[PDB]
Structure 1
Amino acid sequence: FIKGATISYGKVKLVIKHNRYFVETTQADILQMLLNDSVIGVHSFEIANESVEVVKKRCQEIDYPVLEEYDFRNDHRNPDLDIDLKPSTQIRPYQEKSLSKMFGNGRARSGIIVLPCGAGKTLVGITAACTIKKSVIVLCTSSVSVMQWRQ
């Protein structure tokens, strides 16, 4: 079961450039696997913004689970934001562990972090935004919660 659930990770990567999503790949061989795919339609091809949810789900079934990594260190096109955690902060151990699983390899991993209620998930997001140093957007399921983010 574990061997069967094995993937060729990193072959396909989705990138964003000027609000245009390109499904770029690190080898040409993948083209024969994607361009000939029934659902779809150093090499990349265009895809509609709204249709991303189709290719990603299809990518789950054709044995290539795409990864959404960001090289914020090497990204200069986007205007950088200079925000850092002030010295008064004290990141708790589990918060550091949660962030390490995201920035372990140096590239911002896209995923989900689960912590108990009141564990400080807001500070985890703040630290992730502070270290990325780029424009950030936050979505919360209330207006009261939106205000407490700002505070």
Structure 2
Amino acid sequence: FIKGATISYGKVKLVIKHNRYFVETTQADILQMLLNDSVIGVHSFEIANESVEVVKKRCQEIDYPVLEEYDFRNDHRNPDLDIDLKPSTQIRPYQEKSLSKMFGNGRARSGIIVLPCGAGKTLVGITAACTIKKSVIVLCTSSVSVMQWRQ
């Protein structure tokens, strides 16, 4: 089961070249497996950018998963937002481990983090933004709450 849980990691990569999803691969070797699947439509090509959501599912069944690990420092094109914090804030070690989760390589691994209520999840997100240091937006389906996270 662990042996069959071996993926083509680092082998499919979507890059957003200024709101343009270019689905690169690390090699032409991935392309010969990928062309066997025909739902779609080093080497990138045209994909309907809404259909990326469904073909991520489709490549999960055909077991070549894409990774999202942002080289923000190598993406000089997007303007950086160099914003720091105060030394008076104290990061708890589980929040430090959570920051180590997407920064095993330093590239921004995209994913899910769920924490208990009142755990300073706002402060963890503020720390994550202050170490990402790029253009960034915050979303939540309410108003009173959204203005108090702004505060």
What is the TM-score of this pair, normalised by structure 1? 0.94
SS of 1:47's equivalent in the other structure is coil
Contact 2:41 2:48 in 1 (8 A): no
* Deviation readout 1:59-101 (Å, 9 max, x if unpaired): 1011111111100121110011121112222111111110101
Tell me if structure 1 keeps the 8 A contact 2:56–2:66: yes
Q: Output the CA distance in 2 between the equivalents of 1:147 and 1:34.
A: 45
C-alpha separation between the residues in 2 aligned to 1:54 and 1:89? 41
Following the alignment from structure 2 to structure 1, what is the Cα–Cα distance between the partners of residues 15 and 35? 17
How many residues align? The count is: 151
The answer as to whether partners of 1:103 and 1:109 remain within 8 angstroms in 2 is yes
Q: Distance in 1 between matches of 2:111 and 2:84?
A: 22
Aligned-residue sequence identity (percent) comes to 100
Deviation, 1:35, is: 3.1
How far the C-alpha of 1:24 sits from its partner, in A, is 0.3
* Cα distance in 2 between the residues matched to 1:3 and 1:145: 46
Greater CA drift, 141-150 or 20-29: 141-150
Which range moves more in the overlay, 107-116 or 5-14?
5-14
- 3-state SS in 1 of match to 2:124: helix
- Deviation string 1:21-40 (CA, Å, 9 cap, x unpaired) is 01100100111122341211
Q: Which one is further off, 37-46 or 53-62?
A: 37-46
Local SS of the residue matching 2:15? strand
Give the Å deviation of 1:41.
1.9
**Structure 1 vs Structure 2 CA RMSD:** 1.2
Using the TM superposition, give the Cα deviation of residue 121 of structure 1 relative to its aligned residue in structure 2, in angstroms: 1.1
- On the 8 A contact 1:80/1:133 being kept in 2, the answer is yes
Runs of 4+ deviating beyond 4 Å: none
- The unaligned stretches of length 5 or more in structure 1 are none
TM-score of the superposition, structure 2-length normalised?
Answer: 0.94
* Unaligned segments of structure 2, at least 5 residues: none
**Cα distance in structure 2, aligned partners of 1:113 and 1:149:** 18
